Amino acid sequence: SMEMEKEFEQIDKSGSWAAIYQDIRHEASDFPCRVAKLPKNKNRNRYRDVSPFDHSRIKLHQEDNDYINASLIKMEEAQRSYILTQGPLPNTCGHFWEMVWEQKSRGVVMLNRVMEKGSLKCAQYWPQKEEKEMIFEDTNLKLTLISEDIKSYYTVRQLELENLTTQETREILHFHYTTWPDFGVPESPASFLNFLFKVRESGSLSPEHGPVVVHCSAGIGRSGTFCLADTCLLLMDKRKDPSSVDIKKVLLEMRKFRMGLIQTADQLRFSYLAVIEGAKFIMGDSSVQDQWKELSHE
Ligand SMILES: O=C(O)C(=O)Nc1sc2c(c1C(=O)O)CCNC2
Numbered sequence: 139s140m141e142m143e144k145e146f147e148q149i150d151k152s153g154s155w156a157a158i159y160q161d162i163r164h165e166a167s168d169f170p171c172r173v174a175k176l177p178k179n180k181n182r183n184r185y186r187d188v189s190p191f192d193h194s195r196i197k198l199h200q201e202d203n204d205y206i207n208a209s210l211i212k213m214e215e216a217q218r219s220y221i222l223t224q225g226p227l228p229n230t231c232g233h234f235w236e237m238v239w240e241q242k243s244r245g246v247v248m249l250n251r252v253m254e255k256g257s258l259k260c261a262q263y264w265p266q267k268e269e270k271e272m273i274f275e276d277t278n279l280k281l282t283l284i285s286e287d288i289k290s291y292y293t294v295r296q297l298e299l300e301n302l303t304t305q306e307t308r309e310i311l312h313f314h315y316t317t318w319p320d321f322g323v324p325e326s327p328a329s330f331l332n333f334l335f336k337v338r339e340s341g342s343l344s345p346e347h348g349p350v351v352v353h354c355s356a357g358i359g360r361s362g363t364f365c366l367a368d369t370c371l372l373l374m375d376k377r378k379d380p381s382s383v384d385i386k387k388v389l390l391e392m393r394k395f396r397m398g399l400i401q402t403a404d405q406l407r408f409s410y411l412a413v414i415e416g417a418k419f420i421m422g423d424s425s426v427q428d429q430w431k432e433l434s435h436e
Pocket residue numbers: 185187188250259320321354355356357358359360361401
């Protein structure tokens with residue numbers, strides 16, 4: 139077994155996930171979020187306790203108001219970047235696709251549903267029907283649904299994003315995990331990893347593209363779980379060495395760039411499970427990828 143496997147066993151045996159997770163919350167970075175808290179931005183924030191730090195926030199390329207609730211998570215050692223953002227609001231869907239355009243993202247990873255626990259957690263920011271495209275008048279963008287591939291618990295959509303100012307056109311891939319409860323965990327590591335590897339296999343995480351945009355409702359809980367597992371697997375892959383990966387330290391590093399990443403102790407516990415199981419693929423057993431596909435029942 140791996141060293142994270144031994145740690146996992148010991149934390150489970152002693153029932154100390156809550157205290158481990160709370161220790162991460164206590165040590166996490168605290169940086170100012172002054173732009174986020176300006177009164178003119180109050181209606182650009184979904185949650186009053188979830189704000190991007192000033193130092194890592196994504197700036198829109200407009201001179202009236204450059205603010206969006208989004209953070210650049212720049213993982214220097216892993217050499218991968220992600221943009222984590224809240225589920226867009228009815229007045230920030232233009233800003234969201236403006237951000238995708240300006241940052242040259244190829245993929246958007248959505249980990250939530252529009253309605254959860256009886257509430258609207260995210261605006262309907264993409265078109266559901268080919269023939270009903272969306273136009274974002276404030277940012278002058280056009281968005282068309284090109285096709286969609288619906289599986290049991292996730293959906294992949296091809297979108298066309300057009301800068302109406304230049305008539306330039308880009309293909310955006312939308313990866314929508316549709317079975318991960320808010321404040322909850324995926325149904326299995328298998329189905330989480332099946333989805334993550336689908337994002338990976340698309341090419342959307344390539345350094346040739348802008349950072350992938352990852353969001354849930356707040357852009358911290360599920361988004362943080364997704365990013366932590368991906369980065370840990372990537373660090374392991376780069377060194378081909380499971381023992382070089384200290385998952386809690388990686389999470390603390392990520393939290394330098396956005397607050398609150400991973401919102402429950404069980405999501406941290408699940409992060410371990412995903413990385414431990416994903417390690418089998420990283421370390422040369424590609425048959426596990428087939429097993430996940432079956433176990434996930436797509
Ligand atoms: O969507 C996620 O995974 C996520 O982190 N959601 C979060 S984080 C967070 C909230 C929510 C929410 O959805 O209500 C409510 C206010 N406090 C912090």
